[PDB]
Structure 1
Amino acid sequence: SAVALPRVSGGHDEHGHLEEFRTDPIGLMQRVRDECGDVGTFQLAGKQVVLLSGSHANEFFFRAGDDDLDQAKAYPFMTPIFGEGVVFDHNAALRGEQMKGHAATIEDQVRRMIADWGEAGEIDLLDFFAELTIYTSSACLIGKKFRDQLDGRFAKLYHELERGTDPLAYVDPYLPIESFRRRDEARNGLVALVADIMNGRIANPPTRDMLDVLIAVKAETGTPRFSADEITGMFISMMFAGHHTSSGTASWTLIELMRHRDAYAAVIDELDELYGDGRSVSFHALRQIPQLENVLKETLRLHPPLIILMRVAKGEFEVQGHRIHEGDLVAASPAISNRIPEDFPDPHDFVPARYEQPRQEDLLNRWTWIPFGAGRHRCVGAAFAIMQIKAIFSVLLREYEFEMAQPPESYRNDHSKMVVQLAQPACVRYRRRT
């Protein structure tokens, strides 16, 4: 036989620990660490997950070559979402020189989103931010003209796509279950929306964006090179990594601000003061806004949108006396690691001061403060994501005041899917400032 790695307790349901991973993934990953240590395992259906935690194990995880731990085929639930379509058999839109423009675009999207708010009212954070980020992502990554042809429908269907990521995907992403069925219908709904837009552009051409370019590409015969399914597949793929992440992070940032009015007041004074120089959001969102940035960092430590990072071992490796065999699913968890007691004093408390100049607990714990991951695969959209949070709230916090419309403890995440979403209701009251 072979040496067995430590295995966390429980996991006696039909698919081992899968059932528990769906109902309470963080509790399960935490128990793995509490019982096994830096290297423990749990069963996800027919796959064994080697969960790593702590600086040393995380370092190995984040510094391993794309040839040692494969990120491909690690997230089987994504295949049906992107589709088989192939256009060209992130980088561009994310170049620094483009940031200024995106910041201006984001400010515009926010103002348009709150345009009808009036003096006072209420909103649900998930509905608001999920939709807002569809508009920010599509406008910045695909084009403003394209976004102007999008409405709440695109948002709703994209949400359905994200919800079609049940852990059962590790059994088979095409299992005949409701969430997967809705997933497929939603994607077809998305393709139809794009097809309608394409037809509208054919009928009355511009007097141009990415869609216009793609629409104009043709094969020999003269027939259009790309179908609506292929283009949609690409657009979906381009917006996925930054949607649910920015959406959730935006909601939690506001939630923590309302939960901690002293930090909220600090941020307000800061914003009012900084923008007193008369420079635009496109200027300030790309520069230092310390109080808000520290609130964001702490929000990300406590509420990382990706609670688990997956890889597929392509060989045999040794991590702290433990053997990883090729074929094993190897994982790291920002959820668990970001709260390691030793690395972050009072890990369960919201303390943006951790990131202040003299403390910088984020830079000090290079292998455990991992909301954006680390190493070679560190989130490439990190700078954009931070800029977006800066731009969104520079507008929101200066225009309106926000208060929780439900118990502070009632705001929570839904972890029933691999793609974490804020749970509803998430009711918040707003009222114009000044």
Structure 2
Amino acid sequence: SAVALPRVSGGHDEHGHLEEFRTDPIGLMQRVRDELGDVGTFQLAGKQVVLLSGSHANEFFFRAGDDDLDQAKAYPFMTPIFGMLHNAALRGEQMKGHAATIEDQVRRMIADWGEAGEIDLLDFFAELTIYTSSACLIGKKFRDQLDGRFAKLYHELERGTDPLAYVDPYLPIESFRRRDEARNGLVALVADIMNGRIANPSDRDMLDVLIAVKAETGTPRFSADEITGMFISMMFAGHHTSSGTASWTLIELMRHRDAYAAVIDELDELYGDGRSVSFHALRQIPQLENVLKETLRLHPPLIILMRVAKGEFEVQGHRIHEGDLVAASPAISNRIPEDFPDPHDFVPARYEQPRQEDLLNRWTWIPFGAGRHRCVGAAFAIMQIKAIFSVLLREYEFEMAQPPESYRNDHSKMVVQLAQPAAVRYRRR
């Protein structure tokens, strides 16, 4: 019985649909839903990906236990990179402080901005998010010993996630080589901070905690190599997502001056009570929030969510087998026509009380995913954007220095990022 799941057209290239997935993954995924519907597959090298879409299919996907759809082995490119977080830095009691930390990191970042100038959205926000994450999730003391170097290396790590990892995480290609060398540079970086603390024993941070943990032998339990990895781990899920979202929030505001105007008036109005960013970032900021939600629907940082099937299951009559990669796609589900009218349109109103399309499509509006394993950093990420823009939009006004269309994502790697250049002009309000 040579029966198989329905497969999307194409896949002609050497590694099937891989070549396409590295160029236009969203187009490939839309063609799957368009030709096959809710359940369809495409081939990534040797592996088959079972792409689920639509409310019913996604519900099955998100309500499944880690015993059915495991995430652990779904992203082999993470092994070389790495080599819970919630308890350490995401406790609600900590949000207020993180709001202040973030505000401080932003003001520090733009400190040399002056009157007017230009920045690159990817460069600015990517580095800014390294500082906010490192400062909040690990500690300011640690962040203060970091600079553009750490950021540049961390970026090489993210550019080391070419879909070819599904063939082998250690292929002798350039991106995988750069990835390994970059991590080697991150260890040298962390080791230097570690030796400074040991040679010269106060506010304590997560690095202090990891350095102090002793093995039963009495010897320290973690090496510089292991600490760097854990640190890379703590910041990975929150870095490229925040950087990208921040970039696309400013891009959309700039593309739609009407939304920009509204956000600005509301911020000046909100802050008119004299309270701080750490006070307002934890509280409602409607216009800004709806622009954010609309930015996440149109440009979700994770365009595909992966899993490895453990058992034998059936989704809408189609049979999934153990070993199959099962996948959900926020890029695709977030634009399903019947759930989000004019899906390709930037319509913040979509989330105002009268519609709240985000809450009426619990299994389709999945920029943060859904179910039990819905992004645990969601509240932090929202607070961060509020905190970041409360500072930027009040101090500076922005404008595009390139055609509106040239602002787009780079889909060559599993981790999505803004293509360059992404130049933007700024000027003090």
User: What's the offset of the Cα at 1:48?
Assistant: 0.8
Deviation at 1:213, TM superposition (A): 2.6
How high is the TM-score relative to the length of structure 2? 0.98
- Cα separation, 1, equivalents of 2:354 and 2:52: 29
Aligned to 1:142: 138
Q: Which runs of 5+ in 2 are unaligned?
A: none
Give CA-to-partner distance per residue, 1:133-181, whole Å, 9 cap, x none.
0000000000000000000000000000000000000000001100000
Deviations, residues 217-270 of structure 1 (Å, cap 9, x unaligned): 344665433211011111010000000000000000000000000000000000
Match of 1:33 in 2: 33
Q: Is the contact between residue 141 and residue 203 of structure 2 (CA under 8 Å) also seen in structure 1?
A: no
Cα distance in 2 for residues equivalent to 1:218 and 1:327: 38
> In 1, distance between residues paired with 2:427 and 2:308?
49
What are the superposed Cα offsets for residues 282-326 of structure 1, whole Å, 9 maximum, x if unpaired? 110011000000000000000000000001111111111111111
CA distance in 2 between counterparts of 1:178 and 1:345 reads 43
Number of the residue aligned with 1:101 = 97
How big is each residue's C-alpha offset from its partner over 1:44-102, in whole Å with a ceiling of 9 and x where there is no partner? Answer: 111111101111111111111111111110011101110xxxxxxx3331011100000
* Residues 296 and 207 of structure 1: CA distance in aligned 2, closer, same or farther (over 3 Å): closer
Query: How many Å separate the matches in 1 of 2:203 and 2:160?
Result: 40
SS at match of 2:189: helix
Report which stretch shifted further, 207-216 or 274-283: 207-216
Q: CA deviation at 1:205?
A: 2.2
Moved more, 212-221 or 110-119: 212-221
RMSD between aligned alpha carbons? 1.1
- Matched-pair contact (CA < 8 Å) for 2:214–2:220: yes
User: In 2, Cα distance between the equivalents of 1:39 and 1:213?
Assistant: 46
CA distance in 2 between counterparts of 1:350 and 1:206 reads: 48
User: Using the alignment, how far apart are the partners of 2:426 and 2:179 within structure 1?
Assistant: 33
Distance 1:217 1:313, change over 3 A: closer
Question: Is 122-131 or 313-322 further displaced after alignment?
Answer: 313-322
Deviation sequence 1:184-217 (CA, Å, 0-9, x none): 0000000000011111112222692221232233
Alpha-carbon distance change, 294 to 310 in structure 1, aligned in 2, over 3 angstroms: same
Structure 1 position 10, deviation (Å): 0.6
Q: Is the 8 A contact 2:69 2:310 kept in 1?
A: yes
For residues 113 and 210 of structure 1, the distance between their equivalents in structure 2, rounded to whole angstroms, comes to 23
Structure 2 match to 1:85: none
Residue 367 (structure 1) aligns with: 363
Matches within 5 A, 1:377-396: 377-396=373-392
Q: Which residue of the partner structure matches residue 264 of structure 2?
A: 268
CA drift at 1:371? 0.2
Offset of 1:42 from its aligned partner? Answer: 0.4
The whole-number CA distance in structure 2 between the counterparts of 1:167 and 1:406 is 30
Change (3 A) 1:205 1:328: same
In the alignment, the residues of structure 2 paired with residue 210 and residue 323 of structure 1 have an alpha-carbon distance, to the nearest angstrom, of 45
Give, in whole Å, the separation in 2 of the partners of 1:49 and 1:339: 21
Tell me the equivalent position of 1:87: none
> Following the alignment from structure 1 to structure 2, what is the Cα–Cα distance between the partners of residues 290 and 63?
30
**1:108-152 deviation per Cα after TM superposition (whole angstroms, max 9, x unaligned):** 000000000000000000000000000000000000000000000
- SS at 2:87 equivalent: coil
Q: 1:2 deviation in Å? A: 4.5
**How many residues of Structure 1 are paired with residues of Structure 2 in the alignment?**
426
Question: What SS is found at the alignment partner of 2:89?
Answer: coil
Aligned to 1:347: 343
Give TM-score, length-normalised by structure 1. Answer: 0.96
Instruction: Say whether the 8 Å CA contact 2:23–2:412 is kept in structure 1.
Output: yes
- Residues 269/227 of structure 1: CA separation in 2 closer, same or farther (3 Å cut): same
Residues in 2 aligned to 1:177 and 1:418: alpha-carbon distance in whole angstroms: 15
Q: How far apart in 2 are the matches of 1:92 and 1:13?
A: 45
Corresponding residue to 2:239 among 227, 237, 243: 243
Q: CA deviation at 1:271?
A: 0.3
User: Deviations 1:400-419 (Å, cap 9, x if unpaired)?
Assistant: 00000000010000000000
* Aligned mates of 1:4, 1:217 — CA distance in 2: 51
- CA deviations over 1:301-352 (Å, ceiling 9, x no partner): 0000000000111111111111111111110100011001111110001000
Structure 1, residues 357-408: CA drift from partner, whole Å, max 9, x if none? Answer: 1100000011100000011110000000000000000000000000000000
Q: State the SS of the aligned residue for 2:232.
A: helix
The whole-number CA distance in structure 1 between the counterparts of 2:206 and 2:4 is: 52
* Aligned residues of 2:135 and 2:143 also touching (Cα < 8 A): yes
Give SS of 1:403's match.
strand
Query: Which of 314-323 and 250-259 deviates more?
Result: 314-323
**In the aligned structure 2, how far is the partner of 1:312 from the partner of 1:371?**
20
Q: Which runs of structure 2 are paired with 1:3-402 in the superposition (5 Å)?
A: 3-82=3-82, 90-205=86-201, 208-219=204-215, 223-402=219-398
**C-alpha spacing 1:366/1:222, structure 2 compared with 1 (3 Å):** closer
Give the Cα–Cα distance (whole angstroms) in 1 for the partners of residues 268 and 212 of structure 2. 47
| Rounded Cα–Cα distance in structure 2 between residues aligned with 1:255 and 1:230 | 38
Q: Cα distance 1:338–1:204, how it changes in 2: closer, same or farther (>3 A)?
A: same
Unaligned runs of 5+ in 1: 83-89
Question: After alignment, is 292-301 or 318-327 more displaced?
Answer: 318-327
Rounded Cα–Cα distance in structure 2 between residues aligned with 1:182 and 1:134: 19
Q: 1:222 to 1:376 in 2, by over 3 A?
A: closer
Identity %: 99
